[PDB]
């Protein structure tokens, strides 16, 4: 579980073993990650030409 | 009906084939026509896309120069620069009196052909090309037509001149397409007829036209030395003289059999 | 208004068989000039008067 | 391909309006008189041989008696023996239709268990297998849960007769054309 | 099986053919055409006006010949061989009685089953122009068939030298839902199923893309995200142009 | 757009003359000057690069991934060759001479720099191929998880004026692209021994595939990234600008003893 | 009617067939009976 | 004064699909119409010749064909007299072969007005016809009619005869304009299926604006171009517009 | 309303004969409306040559009404601008038609350069060396 192997979590209390990864919310998020980053390198660029 | 036919078929056109050279794009291909230049081109209608690969013929418009219709790739057989005679015209056993030669070449060619199963089970490969030396005109090519005969093999003549084409790779052209065929239609003997032409060891050192020979040599070499290797496809070497083969040739690995004609 | 216009010419000068490159072999003092052009055989050409 | 073209013979007609009304009664997979309602069988074919069969096997397949069933047509005649697996499959042909008209004016694919059993008239077990052999046959498909009671599998069968068919349609046709011209009017209007 | 293509050449010339031949409403113009139809997809390459005339007794009797389509296909062959006939033509007035019954004779020199092309070329409809149908009996039963153009490398070319969105399909939508209702009215009237069935329950859910809408707006952040960059990127270009300006101001009070 | 758009001819830029002006050659032997476009004039305009033509517009139609072809055979691309590790054991000069040589640049550049020795560019090898040599350099291609590119150097040889320079051009193009890579020149004996003497005539289209080869390996190969390793089939001497240092510096021996 | 053009071939859905022309050039055209097969041979115009 | 050549949609289609098809190895044929002159000449409608083997000359109009086919068109309306005669060639500026030429010279002893028009399709494959229409000059037309000219002068005392090019125009009814933007039913069903697939796609799409974006940023940084990422916005700008109408 | 190219472009000098002497906004609005949105290379040039005629008593408006369409796309506008401030500076010798003039006598399209010639003397007739150094 905790470096991700296992698709899921212990519920300790039930003593039963469940599904947390529902498939991976996060699979355009890469994408994003670089969208952000071109954003501020432009915020960046136009306060130069600003002052 | 049918001259009228003839007619019909004069405008029922024809269009001209090229080699696609690499796939670029879905979008861009290049293709060598063979009228000669190379070219970019993109598609048009009906096509599969399926059958498309690197390498394979298509068919390409006389006037947009575009791929109009997908082609299997073919060998071509001919008679011109490789002929071809399934089996030979003469029996192995009717030879009898030639004993000796006709035994070797059995074992080195026969066994393997029928039963890959036993070389493979040892963890040896099986034999690579074989040479025969001593007088081509005691009857050697009698032998080698003779070897085809028994197995059923498809038997390739080889003018080892005419593998010497005075133009931009038809001369690599005639390799690849003799050793495709030979998997095809293996089992097979390919049979090189005088070797000093396509392996010589220069004429004194100095070059004419004796780098044509090198680049003929290197081909042969680089199939062997490959990922592809030789035991349905079975080549055999045939001169007079050892004094005009190779140095590589005469290096095992190459050439491992060397049967003499006693 | 411009960028229409440079449109224009840029497509005027997208039509074209394109220029040969030559060497000069010798300039003749009436105004011809010998050349040896690559893409073909020997020619002798009118000696421009941009040039 | 008889009728239209004549040439007919009072032996073949006899042979064929019987042989259909036996026919009828013995096997089916549409539904069990709508269709020969759009169907002669004896609009002037012939009349012959107690064709009352047509008209006393709808109330047969609606009731769903066993006496009706003897006094449908004559009691071995019937049976065949080809009823004993004929009447599972006569009886999910008019729950199907029935219910296919009836629920919902736009036709949707959710039906009640319980209510599919009261129309039915089949107890808890025995319904579930009959559902269970309906599912196999298609027509259907879009995958009813078994746990949520639902019955939930897709609209796409045939609909019956062009009596209801129409009344059903009008309805559906206020409906479909009303969803367009709101749709229409916003965009237009901006 | 079917999938027709059809020259524009086709609709031009049985457009400039009505109204030079000086047809008038309540007269047919019927033409032939020929062309490839014994391959999956039906290939008009070529059609020809057909002499027609109707009688003043009653306008279903009427003249065609079979002769001049004899010798014309065989004038066809000679510039373009494949270019034989299958078929036939249509202007208008439209699907009269012996509208089915050109059928009967034009079966009498076809090679398959005459393809019937009725198409509006006077261009006075709205929509399509093409009301193709293949010719099958049983009566004017007529089996519509949707498609036109394809054409050839130089036609298209050609084509656009002479020449040189959801509302308008929402009200198109609208149109046939209302026609299809005053049908049905029209039809229990007179008569005193899926389709229909598919076209109400599924729409009920701008519409359909409500279910999906959960999907969209996912992405949708992400694209105005983009479009929010691409803003950013204007206001810089703007400064440039505003310094631009600065500068010329500030060389002439210099000078 | 649609003027510009296939059927296509392929060009080569040869460099840029001037604005929104460049000198082609076509492949077919017509160079024709042309424009470039105004958005291909800035950011995407390389000296010398592969082009896509029209055969009428004499403009610049779109740029290409360097790979264009010739009339001679197209060379061999192998990723992960087959051949990996099959003679081994009493081979140990030779392998442990291999293995710094070839292997070490591919994976690190940076090491060889930072000590400021100069980097293997090219290699010489020689001694027998296809006995226990030809083995090894398909292994440490593999190992290094570089594309093993087969490169055929007999085959230049073409009988033509320069469609082999072009091809050349191309292919080491392509390897600094494609970095890790090997290209593996089979037989260089042939495309190089002439004149030391005066001997060896008639190689004068080897020649520019000769000078072509030069400026494209030692213009490259700075901090080496790309492996060029030469082949003969035992030893042949070399015309003298690929022997000097700066290219073929480590010159390996397979052991007669 | 001569000037014509001249194939000298070499070589040996439906059915296809390569003709090698003497400008070097490789032309599809059918074997489906629409062209014969004893118009080719090798080794001749 | 002179010609001014209108050709119709038929016409104009007719010429490319004959002459495409009848290529240089040349097809020849005759053109139809007719006109009242000094500005307005109407070429209606063209008719092919069938192939004959000794190339695109006098002896290639088929006298038993172009009869035949005057008669047969006539019954159907479309048939009208010649306006002069079409082909195929290999393209010139002073003349598209010889043969139209030595063709056009017997056809100018008979009429006074028949020009000779030609397509060629080696340069209408880069994507805009080449087409030419020239005929020869006439005495005493050409020069009552457009110091004075000179040149023009001592040109027709001369030659009597040489080479001049006429306009290319086009005519069509609006009928035909209307009806044509209906097909180029397809376009609006088509329509519809395409904003459907396109949200499939989306999501590739998707990601290569956003590469696109990171070169452009990119970009700006390394000048410090600007052309270009404003063009690179525009477009961008456009695909969300579309990428919103969709869904 | 007819949608032939000869009747349209005659339509244009309708507007600037009937509303001549004094200026009128609806008569200008209908006919920069028509030069605007109308492609048909006839029917600019005309629709510019008729606001000349309605602005003769107002001339002193024309070279701003005019300044853009001087310098706007399409040889034909630009010839029809030409037109406008000759008829309607004719006599006055306005400085500012003038300089409007300069650019476009030296203008590449040859017609372009004819009727800028026949403008530009029309306005200058009798006005001589000193006076105006320019001529």
Not at chain 5, 165 to 194: A, F, M, P
Not at chain 5, 196 to 225: R, S
Not at chain 6, 104 to 123: N, S, T
Not at chain 8, 92 to 110: A, I, P, R
Request: proline content about 4%; hydrophobic content about 40%; aromatic content about 6%.
């Amino acid at each position: 579980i905790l470096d991700k192997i296992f698709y899921g979590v212990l519920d300790q209390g039930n003593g039963w073993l469940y599904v947390y990864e529902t498939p991976n919310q996060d699979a355009t998020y890469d994408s994003a990650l670089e969208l952000v980053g071109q954003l501020n390198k432009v915020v960046d660029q136009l306060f130069e030409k600003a002052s | 009906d049918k001259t009228e036919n003839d007619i019909k078929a004069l405008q029922s056109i024809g269009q001209l084939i090229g080699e696609v050279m690499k796939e670029l794009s879905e979008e861009k291909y290049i293709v060598k026509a063979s009228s000669g230049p190379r070219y970019i081109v993109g598609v048009r209608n009906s096509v599969d896309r399926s059958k498309l690969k690197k390498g394979v013929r298509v068919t390409l418009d006389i006037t947009t120069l575009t791929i109009m219709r997908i082609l299997p790739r073919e060998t071509d057989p001919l008679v011109y620069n490789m002929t071809s005679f399934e089996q030979g015209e003469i029996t192995f056993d009717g030879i009898g009196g030639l004993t000796e030669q006709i035994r070797e070449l059995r074992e080195v060619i026969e066994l393997p052909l029928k039963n890959p199963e036993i070389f493979q089970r040892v963890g040896i490969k099986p034999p690579k090309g074989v040479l025969l030396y001593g007088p081509p005109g005691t009857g050697k090519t009698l032998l080698a037509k003779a070897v085809a005969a028994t197995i059923g093999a498809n038997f390739i003549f080889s003018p080892a001149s005419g593998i010497v084409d005075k133009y931009i790779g038809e001369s690599a052209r005639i390799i690849r397409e003799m050793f495709a065929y030979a998997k095809e239609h293996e089992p097979c003997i390919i049979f090189m007829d005088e070797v000093d032409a396509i392996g010589g060891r220069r004429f004194s050192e100095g070059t004419s036209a004796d780098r044509e020979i090198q680049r003929t040599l290197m081909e042969l070499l680089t199939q062997m030395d490959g990922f592809d290797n030789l035991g349905q496809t079975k080549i055999i070497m045939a001169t007079n003289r050892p004094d005009t083969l190779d140095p590589a040739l005469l290096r095992p690995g190459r050439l491992d059999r060397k049967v003499e004609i006693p | 208004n411009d960028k229409v216009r440079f449109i224009k010419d840029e497509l005027r000068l997208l039509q074209e068989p394109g220029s040969y490159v030559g060497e000069v072999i010798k300039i003749v003092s009436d105004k011809k000039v010998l050349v040896k052009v690559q893409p073909e055989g020997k020619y002798i050409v009118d000696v421009a008067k941009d040039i | 391909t008889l009728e239209p073209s004549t040439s007919i013979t009072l032996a073949e007609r006899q042979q064929l309006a019987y042989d259909l009304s036996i026919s009828a009664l013995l096997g089916d997979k549409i539904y069990n008189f709508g269709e020969l309602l759009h169907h002669p069988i004896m609009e002037t074919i012939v009349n012959d041989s107690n064709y009352d069969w047509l008209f006393q096997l709808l109330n047969a397949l609606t009731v769903g008696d066993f006496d009706k069933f003897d006094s449908l047509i004559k009691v071995q005649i019937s049976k065949i023996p080809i009823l004993a697996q004929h009447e599972s499959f006569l009886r999910q042909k008019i729950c199907l239709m029935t219910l296919i008209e009836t629920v919902f004016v736009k036709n949707i694919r959710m039906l009640s268990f319980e209510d599919i059993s009261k129309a039915t008239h089949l107890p808890k077990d025995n319904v579930e297998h009959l559902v269970m052999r309906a599912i196999s046959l298609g027509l259907l498909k879009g995958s009813i849960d078994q746990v949520n009671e639902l019955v939930t599998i897709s609209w796409v069968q045939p609909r019956i007769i062009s009596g209801d068919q129409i009344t059903k349609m009008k309805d559906r046709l206020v409906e479909w054309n009303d969803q367009v011209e709101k749709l229409g009017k916003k965009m237009e209007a901006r | 099986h079917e999938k027709v293509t059809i020259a524009p050449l086709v609709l031009l010339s049985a457009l400039d053919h009505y109204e030079r031949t000086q047809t008038k409403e309540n007269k047919r113009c019927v033409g032939v055409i020929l062309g490839d139809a014994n391959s999956s997809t039906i290939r008009v390459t070529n059609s020809f006006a057909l002499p027609f005339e109707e009688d003043e007794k009653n306008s279903d009797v009427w003249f065609l010949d079979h002769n001049y389509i004899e010798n014309m296909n065989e004038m066809c062959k000679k510039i373009n061989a494949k270019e034989k006939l299958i078929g036939w033509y249509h202007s208008g007035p439209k699907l009269r009685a012996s509208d089915l019954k050109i059928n009967e004779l034009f079966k009498k020199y076809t090679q398959n089953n005459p393809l019937l092309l009725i198409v509006d070329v006077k261009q006075q409809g709205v929509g399509l122009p093409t009301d193709a149908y293949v010719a099958i009996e049983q009566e004017k039963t007529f089996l519509h068939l949707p498609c036109t153009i394809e054409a050839e490398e130089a036609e298209e070319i050609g084509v656009e030298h002479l020449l040189r969105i959801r509302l308008t399909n929402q009200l198109k939508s609208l149109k046939g839902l209302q026609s299809k209702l005053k049908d049905v009215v029209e039809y229990l009237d007179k008569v005193i199923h899926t389709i229909l069935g598919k076209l109400q329950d599924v729409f009920n859910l701008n519409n359909l893309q409500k279910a999906l809408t959960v999907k969209t707006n996912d992405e949708l952040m992400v694209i105005y995200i983009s479009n929010l960059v691409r803003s950013i990127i204007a206001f810089d270009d703007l400064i440039e142009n505003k310094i631009q300006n600065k500068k010329i101001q500030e060389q002439r009070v210099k000078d | 757009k649609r003027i510009q758009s296939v059927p296509l001819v392929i060009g080569q830029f040869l460099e840029p003359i001037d604005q929104n002006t460049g000198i082609v050659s076509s492949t077919t032997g017509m160079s024709y000057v042309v424009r470039i476009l105004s958005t291909l004039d800035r950011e995407l305009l390389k000296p010398s690069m592969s082009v896509a033509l029209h055969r009428h517009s004499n403009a610049l139609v779109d740029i290409l991934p360097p790979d264009s072809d010739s009339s001679i055979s197209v060379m061999g691309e192998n990723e992960k060759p087959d051949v990996t590790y099959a003679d081994v054991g009493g081979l140990d000069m030779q392998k442990q001479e291999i293995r710094e040589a070839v292997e070490l640049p591919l994976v690190q550049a940076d090491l060889y720099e930072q000590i400021g020795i100069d980097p293997p560019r090219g290699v010489l090898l020689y001694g027998p191929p296809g006995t226990g040599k030809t083995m090894l350099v398909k292994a440490v291609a593999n190992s290094t998880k570089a594309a093993f590119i087969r490169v055929n150097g007999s085959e230049f040889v073409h009988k033509y004026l320069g469609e082999g320079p072009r091809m050349v051009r191309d292919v080491f193009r392509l390897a600094r692209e494609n970095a890790p890579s090997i290209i593996f020149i089979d037989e260089v004996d042939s495309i190089a021994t002439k004149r030391f003497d005066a001997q060896t005539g008639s190689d004068r289209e080897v020649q520019r595939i000769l000078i072509e080869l030069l400026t494209q390996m030692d213009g490259f190969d700075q901090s080496t990234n790309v492996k060029v390793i030469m082949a003969t089939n035992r030893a042949d001497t070399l015309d003298p600008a690929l022997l000097r240092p700066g290219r073929l510096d480590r010159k390996i021996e397979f052991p007669s003893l | 009617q001569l000037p014509y053009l001249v194939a000298n071939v070499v070589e040996v859905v439906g059915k296809a067939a390569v003709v090698k022309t003497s400008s070097r050039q490789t032309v599809f055209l059918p074997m489906v009976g629409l062209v014969d097969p004893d118009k080719l041979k090798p080794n001749d115009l | 004064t002179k010609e001014t050549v209108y050709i119709s949609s038929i016409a104009l289609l007719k010429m490319l699909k004959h002459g495409r098809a009848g290529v240089p190895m040349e097809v020849m044929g005759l053109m139809l119409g007719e006109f009242v002159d000094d500005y307005t000449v109407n070429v209606v409608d063209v008719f092919a010749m069938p192939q004959s083997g000794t190339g695109v000359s006098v002896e290639a109009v088929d006298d038993v064909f172009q009869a035949k086919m005057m008669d047969m068109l006539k019954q159907t309306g479309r048939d009208q007299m010649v306006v002069g005669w079409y082909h195929s060639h290999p393209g010139f500026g002073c003349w598209l072969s010889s043969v139209d030429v030595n063709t056009q010279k017997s056809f100018e002893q008979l009429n006074s007005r028949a020009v000779a028009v030609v397509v060629d399709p080696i340069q209408s494959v880069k994507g805009k016809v080449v087409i030419d229409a020239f005929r020869l000059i006439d005495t005493g037309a050409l020069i009552n009619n457009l110091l004075n000219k000179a040149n023009i002068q001592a040109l027709i005392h001369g030659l009597n005869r040489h080479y001049y090019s006429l306009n290319i125009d086009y005519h069509k009814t609006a009928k035909e304009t209307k009806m044509l933007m209906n097909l180029h039913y397809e376009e609006k069903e088509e329509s519809n299926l395409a904003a459907t697939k396109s949200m499939v796609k989306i999501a590739e799409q998707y990601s290569k604006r956003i590469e696109e974006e990171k070169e452009l940023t990119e970009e700006e940084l390394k000048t410090r171009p600007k052309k270009h990422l404003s063009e690179t916005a525009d477009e961008t700008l456009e695909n969300n517009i579309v990428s919103v109408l969709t869904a | 309303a007819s949608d032939e190219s000869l009747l349209r472009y005659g339509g244009a000098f309708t507007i600037a004969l009937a509303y001549a002497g004094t200026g009128n906004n609806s008569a200008v609005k209908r006919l920069l409306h028509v030069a605007v949105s109308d492609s048909n290379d006839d029917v600019r040039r005309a629709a510019v040559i008729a606001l000349g005629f309605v602005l003769l008593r107002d001339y002193t408006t024309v070279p701003r009404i005019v300044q853009l369409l001087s310098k706007s796309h399409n040889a034909h506008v630009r010839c029809g601008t030409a037109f406008a401030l000759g008829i309607a500076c004719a006599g006055k010798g306005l400085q500012s038609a003038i300089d409007v003039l300069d650019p476009l006598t030296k203008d590449p399209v040859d017609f372009v350069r004819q009727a800028a010639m026949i403008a530009l003397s029309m306005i200058l007739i009798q006005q001589t060396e000193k006076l105006n150094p320019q001529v």
